[PDB]
Design a protein around this ligand. Sequence first.
Ligand SMILES: [Mg+2]
Ligand SMILES: [Zn+2]
Ligand SMILES: [Zn+2]
Lengths: 141, 139
Amino acid sequence: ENCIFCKIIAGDIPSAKVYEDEHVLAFLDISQVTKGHTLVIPKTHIENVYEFTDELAKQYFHAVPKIARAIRDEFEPIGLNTLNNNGEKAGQSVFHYHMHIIPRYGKGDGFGAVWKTHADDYKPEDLQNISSSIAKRLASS
Amino acid sequence: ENCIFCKIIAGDIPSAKVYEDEHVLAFLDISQVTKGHTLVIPKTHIENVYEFTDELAKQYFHAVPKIARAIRDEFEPIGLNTLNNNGEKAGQSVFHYHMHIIPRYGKGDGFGAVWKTHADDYKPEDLQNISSSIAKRLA
Ligand SMILES: [Mg+2]
Ligand SMILES: [Zn+2]
Ligand SMILES: [Zn+2]
């Protein structure tokens, strides 16, 4: 288990905790993209968002809103984002599911989303075929 | 309401539906920052992540991993992100909670994260103070 997050859950590595219960553990990201940068992870070692089961999703997500409101009330930012990365090329460096809670203050934010639209590259029927394909795989969910 | 997403949920505005159940509706984002770009939203109207109740949270999140896997198997991307924006300054264009599920293919991806670390700007004691402060409200 060469997972830095499992060692933080196990206490082997110190952390600045903000929230903790039976299945969830939240703590400040030492990178602090912005003041209040928090990491919310499940204690169960789940590699990515794909390995989530309904039962595990239930013991996890509820903490996100609570922690988000706590950060918003403490530092009253002008905005806030939640980000999850799955896969090296998606930005995931540690293979243990984690959600970033990033408060926004404006000028100086260490986080920003590059947004390149491509709406003119898809026709209504293409979108319908694409969605229809994803949906078919979901009939079993 | 005057919410464009609530209108999609009601059926007034058409959409490329990807997923739908009792309390959740997911559809493609016409912006398609990447092929398969999908918006997952709760049928119940809430402006942002702050208005989540435990029950609504329970009936919502389970759909994200399911949709993520479907987009995974369909397009076989080399990565995938989930992004939620709260506040105009955070990128929120439509004020109805929503989760962006963005598959990544590499070269050409319309989405990317600007990451600027500031670890040397804080001392171990500062992290303790910042964290403790937050933890106070969470109790
Ligand atoms: Mg299936
Ligand atoms: Zn781990
Ligand atoms: Zn709405």
